[PDB]
Amino acid sequence: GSGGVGQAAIAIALSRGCRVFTTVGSAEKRAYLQARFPQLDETCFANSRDTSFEQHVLRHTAGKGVDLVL
Amino acid sequence: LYLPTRFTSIRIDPVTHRQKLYTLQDTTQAADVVVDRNLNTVVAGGALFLGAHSSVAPRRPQEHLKPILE
């Protein structure tokens, strides 16, 4: 959601009240996003340099998973 | 009755496995094991399974143990 289509894909989904889970490479990118979209918890953010995000998404999902992946 | 059938990503490192291990008072050896069925990972000493799906097998009655009904 740091990137181009991410940023939009976030805005679109948020418009419709969807629980968002975005992943990001850089500390400072967490920053920007958090500012811009205020509706974002810290639970929303996982990593992208990595596979870590599967774990992270499986926690706050209660091993249920997500409805759509972009 | 359930045997294994798929693992998704086993990962062993005997280097850390040595370190993770410990000695009881029994003098024997052991380590900690954790299961996280929300993440579907098992971890123990220096080996961690991720996504270790298993599956059902049929019990094969051994008709030499057919009990006497009086």
Side-chain angles (χ1 to χ4, degrees), chain A:
Chain A
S2 41
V5 74
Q7 287 203 51
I10 278 167
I12 299 225
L14 283 190
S15 83
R16 314 208 155 182
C18 303
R19 178 171 189 21
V20 145
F21 270 149
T22 214
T23 102
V24 143
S26 318
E28 186 193 338
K29 277 159 160 193
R30 285 175 158 107
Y32 187 86
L33 278 171
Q34 173 57 20
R36 170 145 163 164
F37 312 94
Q39 335 193 354
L40 295 170
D41 311 316
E42 69 207 7
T43 55
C44 296
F45 298 23
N47 217 254
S48 72
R49 298 267 174 267
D50 203 354
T51 277
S52 93
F53 71 84
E54 181 197 354
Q55 281 51 90
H56 177 93
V57 161
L58 286 197
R59 271 171 222 142
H60 319 225
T61 222
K64 281 296 130 215
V66 150
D67 276 325
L68 316 82
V69 176
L70 192 55

Side-chain angles (χ1 to χ4, degrees), chain B residues 23-29:
Chain B
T23 11
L24 315 171
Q25 221 150 6
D26 197 329
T27 214
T28 52
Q29 267 177 127

Side-chain angles (χ1 to χ4, degrees), chain B residues 2-66:
Chain B
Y2 274 74
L3 311 142
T5 265
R6 287 206 84 241
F7 296 76
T8 267
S9 173
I10 312 175
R11 264 179 289 165
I12 302 193
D13 164 33
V15 191
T16 284
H17 179 88
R18 288 307 164 174
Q19 287 175 329
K20 220 72 196 184
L21 213 26
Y22 55 22
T23 11
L24 315 171
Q25 221 150 6
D26 197 329
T27 214
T28 52
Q29 267 177 127
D32 290 11
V33 60
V34 177
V35 163
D36 191 348
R37 343 202 172 223
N38 277 358
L39 317 206
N40 335 89
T41 101
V42 155
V43 186
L48 91 70
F49 291 9
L50 163 23
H53 163 106
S54 16
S55 43
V56 151
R59 300 201 76 189
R60 53 146 216 175
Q62 334 162 40
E63 293 276 351
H64 64 271
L65 264 215
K66 185 185 170 188

